[PDB]
Assembly symmetry: C3
Homo-oligomer: 37 residues x 3
Amino acid sequence: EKTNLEIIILEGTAVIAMFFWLLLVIILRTVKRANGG
Amino acid sequence: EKTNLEIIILEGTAVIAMFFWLLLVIILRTVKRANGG
Amino acid sequence: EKTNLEIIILEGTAVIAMFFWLLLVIILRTVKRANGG
C-alpha cells in the first residue's frame, strides 16, 4: 500500500527521466545530423 | 529481496503505462490527422 | 530516503530493460525487412 507512493514517483520519474533523455538524444542527433551539407 | 517484487510491478507498469500512453497518443494524433480530406 | 536506492535501480533498469526490448525489436524488424532484394 505504501510502496505505491514510490510507484507514482517511479512511474512518473520513469517516463519523465526517459523523455528528458530521449529529448537531449534527439537534439544531439538532430544537430550532429545537420553539420553536413 | 522484497523490493524486487515492486521492481516487477514497476518495471512492467513502467514500460506498460508508457506504451499505453504513447499508444493513445499516436491514436489521437492518427485520428486528428484523419479528419481532413 | 532508502526507497531512493530502488529508484536508481528502477529508473535505470526501467529505461534499460526498455531499450533492451525496443532494441531486439528494431533488430528483428530490421532483419525481416532485409530478406528482400
